[PDB]
Design a protein around this ligand. Structure first.
Ligand code: HEM
Ligand SMILES: O[C@H](C[C@H]1c2ccccc2-c2cncn21)C1CCCCC1
Length: 374
């Protein structure tokens, strides 16, 4: 793979994200690195409002621009939602909104915190010579003490990383159809299936590191956006950059490329059909790093893996293909059980129906791609 910013070890995750910005930006970093303290003491907003305007010119390399997106995105979430009890701000001040927006357009991303900010670039190893294991990793930024952001972000990232070993096989699949190399393709499909079955075990770590109460009542709040949100009905005013309010959705794993790229690979047309679910997933591509968007665009322009398998009358190939679809169905089914525990039941003490019907649509579409099954 080329300049699609895909890493052979960590996949769509940003490799070795840097922890520190230039000294020109310490006033940003001191805020972001102390969000728990400043929100609780009610000092955050005042200190945001006391900021001067830094130019984004001293952010020269891609890594530091990503880190700055993660810093200004967390600060914005904290500024907008405050202590997370519903007393919101509807105006982002000039002095953070301008640099945040100039940086976001520079990177072809919206000026709101997205998946690629707070998962893909929000991590580090404690010990660089150890393995990419939960025990040896940590997030860069959290919102509140006890918000379980570390567990939530890291377990997502560890799933993202487990998918990386299946991504590096994609080149093999397309090369094999182009060369009409059936046995080579069959093995490639089985290797992808195996990797997706291994990513299921990674999901099991969510239970040991995320608490439903804290997740539902705290973390969810700081991850909300201002699209179709009754609390900022017309959106957020990015003061000094746009005279008008604007709506952007909060962080959503529909912005993640790991599952979409396998949907594309397997010919699971998740974005066809006119439903709300297809609409949502297509909309969320604008919240992906443009290089990953372009990678997904490259997958779609390739010949259909599915139609190739269906056209060969080859039971071995159809079973290898179905192994991949079954593995995807298995992930989304377990994931649905997660949502039941972490959203549905906390909501009822001790809305979600729309969210789960979305996931259920995505799952059933996946399940309908199975072959000689029906
Ligand atoms: C407490 C744990 C979790 C909860 C409550 C949860 C909840 C949700 C919800 C409500 C959605 C639909 C809205 C959206 O797009 O974000 C969703 C989608 C999604 N989530 Fe999660 N999630 C959790 C953990 C994870 C983890 C660890 C991953 C690993 C990457 C993940 C991957 C995805 C993906 C790929 C989607 C897009 C839908 C699909 O492809 O089927 N989720 N999740
Ligand atoms: O699903 C998204 C959150 C999202 C997210 C944000 C940041 C990092 C990871 C993830 C994630 C993983 N699965 C869903 N999401 C919201 C949807 C509203 C309920 C609380 C979760």
């Amino acid at each position: 793979s080329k300049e699609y910013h895909i890493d052979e070890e960590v996949g769509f995750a940003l490799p070795n994200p840097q922890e520190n910005l230039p000294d020109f930006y310490n006033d940003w970093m001191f805020i972001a690195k102390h969000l728990p303290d400043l929100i609780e003491s009610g000092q955050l907003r005042e200190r945001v409002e006391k900021l001067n305007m830094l130019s984004i010119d001293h952010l020269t390399d891609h890594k530091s621009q990503r880190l700055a997106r993660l810093v200004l995105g967390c600060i914005t979430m904290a500024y907008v939602w405050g202590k997370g009890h519903g007393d919101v701000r509807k105006v982002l001040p000039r002095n953070i909104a301008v640099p945040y927006c100039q940086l976001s357009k520079k990177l072809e991303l919206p000026p709101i915190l997205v998946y690629a900010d707070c998962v893909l670039a929000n991590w580090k190893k404690k010990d660089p010579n150890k393995p990419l294991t939960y025990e040896n990793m940590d997030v860069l930024f959290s919102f509140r003490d006890g918000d379980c952001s570390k567990g939530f972000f890291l377990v997502s990232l560890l799933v993202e990383i487990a998918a990386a070993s299946a991504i590096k096989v994609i080149p093999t699949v397309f090369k094999a159809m182009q060369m009409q190399e059936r046995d080579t393709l069959l093995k490639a499909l089985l290797e992808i299936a195996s990797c997706l079955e291994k990513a299921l075990q990674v999901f099991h770590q969510i239970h040991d590191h995320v608490n439903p109460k804290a997740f539902f009542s705290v973390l969810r709040i700081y991850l909300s956006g201002w699209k179709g949100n009754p609390q900022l009905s017309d959106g957020l005013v990015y003061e000094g950059f746009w005279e008008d309010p604007k709506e952007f959705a909060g962080g959503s794993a529909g912005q993640s490329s790991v599952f979409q790229c396998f949907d594309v690979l397997l010919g699971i047309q998740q974005t066809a059909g006119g439903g709300h679910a297809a609409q949502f997933l297509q909309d969320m591509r604008r919240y992906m790093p443009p290089a990953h968007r372009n990678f997904l665009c490259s997958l779609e322009s390739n010949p259909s893996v599915r139609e190739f398998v269906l056209s060969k009358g080859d039971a071995g190939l159809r079973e290898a293909y179905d192994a991949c679809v079954k593995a995807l169905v298995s992930l989304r089914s377990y994931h649905l059980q997660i949502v039941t525990k972490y959203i549905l039941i906390p909501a009822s003490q001790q809305g979600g129906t729309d969210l789960m019907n979305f996931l259920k649509t995505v799952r059933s579409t996946t399940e309908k791609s199975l072959l000689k099954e029906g």
